[PDB]
């Protein structure tokens, strides 16, 4: 913690910058040693296709893991969300 | 178990009969006392909208809980799936 809060901040921020993300609805992050393992849910446009939602999830996973190096496991899922 | 396997059978079967379900991809079911609590993932058409996928999930939840009375908690989520 404290230092976790700073990491979580960077995860939320990294995710929100990815096209199609309507907020991070949920983020659970934990230290396994010096590595982070995490799970998040993002908001998506309810009219996107399931495919697009899966694409946005992958894109988040890559942007986030691309920016926070200590992350060794991130699962990203999606939920319909209004703006 | 044994009797769990019979319940799980009925959950899979109930789910597959619901329009838009492309198989049950995952089912975790457990006894809390004499009640079942469960979580499942269904296949959906990747071109459905996220909204439709959420609708199909609710419809599964209701059909299944409507048919297996001992179920007191069922969460249903969806994943893109090819036929």
Author numbering:
A (entry chain A), B (entry chain A): 211 to 293
Give the original sentences from the paper that presented this experimental model.
To test this hypothesis, we combined the D249A point mutation at the central binding site and the H264A mutation at peripheral sites. Although no cation binding was detected for the resulting double mutant, D249A + H264A, by ITC in vitro it still produced magnetite particles in vivo. However, magnetite formation was severely affected in the D249A+H264A mutant as a significant non-additive decrease of the magnetic response, the average particle numbers and the average crystal sizes were observed. In addition the D249A+H264A double mutant showed a drastically delayed formation of magnetite during iron induction experiments. These results suggest that proper sensory and regulatory activity of the CTD can be achieved through a single type of binding site, either the central or the two peripheral sites, to allow proper activation and transport of MamM TMD. Therefore, the reduced magnetite formation reflects decreased MamM activities caused by less (e.g. MamM D249A) and/or shorter (e.g. MamM D249A+H264A) TMD activation events. To confirm that these observed phenotypic differences are due to true transport function alternations, we also examined the expression levels of all MamM mutants, their ability to stabilize MamB expression, performed MD simulations for dimer stability evaluation and determined their CTD structures. (ii) All mutants exhibited an apo-MamM CTD-like behavior along the MD simulations, and (iii) an absence of structural differences was observed.
